[PDB]
Write a protein that binds this DNA or RNA. Structure first.
Ligand SMILES: [Cl-]
Length: 346
RNA sequence: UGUAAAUA
């Protein structure tokens, strides 16, 4: 029987097994649940750097078979850790040709993410040179988008310009990514980490189809990131569009969160625009803030208004809603809605 | 009373 069957049989019988004992059994050990845990434990606990190197040639030689294995991917990742710098370059060479497909695989993509998290900028750039070949499809992928997000978090902005240029490759690409469950996460990282010269055309593209993206189940989060990471003029264009169309935005499922984001991140003069729209007379109807309090989504928006505005801005909300309180108690959940506001009407 | 993610 081979070393692994023997070691799996009685684990404690070989409490004195060492990494240099594995030798040619590394592949079988790494693809085995018990074997892989042994290798990992030894790599993390051994103080012998020559033990740790004794298995590295077999890791490199079997790299393609290990990176997308349920148990072997951990073994490969061990050699991208801080403490194995001396191995990083050799290990990138071992996987580089197949990075374009590793990015889509559920185990291998965790190797790529660990590499980008740990390795120096020349090696990151090398990995991204392969990602560049599959970048559009990669951004829309459950696995590939995690690789792209890590690249944006960990590489200097100038070396992800190719990703920004993919978001800008065609008129509708930013829309297509913003409404994709995976592509929307890439747009968000870009907004968080890219330079102002990179984010400005991206935000400009989002603005052109703003109403659709704001009410999309994924796009509303993209718009929320524009509010938080865009410029003052961006917030102003957004607050201005939201104020002018306050009832439409507040009474839809996803765009209602966009208004809440404006209230949390907004300057006093943005809040004042939203409050003024909310309290405007409307000669032939009740004020918009009252209609919103009757609505399944907008009542949370009104609650957020009261919680976020100045005392003087609360004054106008209180003076506008209080006449209509009796009617509002009747409506569905109207009891609870006004209860959560009682502290402002006491 | 209302929204999001790939490993043993
Ligand atoms: Cl998969």
């Amino acid at each position: 029987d081979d070393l692994l069957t023997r070691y799996r049989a009685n684990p404690a019988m070989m409490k004195n097994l060492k990494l240099s004992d594995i030798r040619g059994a590394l592949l079988k050990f790494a693809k085995d649940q018990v074997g892989s845990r042994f290798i990992q434990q030894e790599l993390a606990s051994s103080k012998d750097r020559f033990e740790k190197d004794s298995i590295f040639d077999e890791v490199v030689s079997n790299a393609d078979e290990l990176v997308d294995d349920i148990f072997g991917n951990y073994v490969v990742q061990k050699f991208f850790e801080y403490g194995e710098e001396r191995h990083w370059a050799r290990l990138v060479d071992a996987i580089i040709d197949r990075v374009p497909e590793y990015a889509f695989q559920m185990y291998a993509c965790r190797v790529l993410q660990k590499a980008l998290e740990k390795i120096n900028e020349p090696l990151q750039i090398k990995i991204l040179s392969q990602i560049r070949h599959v970048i559009h499809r990669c951004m829309k992928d459950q696995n590939g988008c995690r690789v792209v997000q890590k690249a944006i978090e960990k590489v200097s902005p100038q070396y992800v310009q190719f990703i920004v240029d993919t978001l800008l490759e065609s008129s509708n690409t930013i829309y297509e990514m913003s409404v994709d469950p995976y592509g929307c996460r890439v747009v968000q990282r870009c907004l968080e980490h890219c330079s102002p010269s990179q984010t400005k055309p991206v935000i400009g593209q989002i603005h052109k189809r703003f109403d659709e993206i704001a009410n999309n189940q994924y796009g509303n989060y993209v718009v929320q990131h524009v509010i938080e990471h865009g410029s003052e003029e961006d917030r102003m264009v957004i607050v201005t569009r939201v104020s002018n169309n306050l009832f439409e935005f507040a009474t839809h499922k996803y765009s209602s969160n966009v208004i809440e984001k404006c209230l949390e991140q907004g300057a006093v003069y943005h809040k004042s625009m939203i409050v003024g729209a909310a309290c405007h007379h409307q000669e032939g109807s009740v004020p918009i803030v009252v209609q919103m309090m009757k609505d399944q989504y907008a009542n949370y928006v009104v609650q957020k208004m009261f919680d976020q505005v100045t005392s003087e801005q609360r004054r106008e909300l209180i003076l506008t809603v209080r006449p209509h309180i009796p009617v509002l108690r009747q409506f569905p959940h109207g009891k609870h809605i006004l209860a959560k506001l009682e502290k402002y009407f006491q």
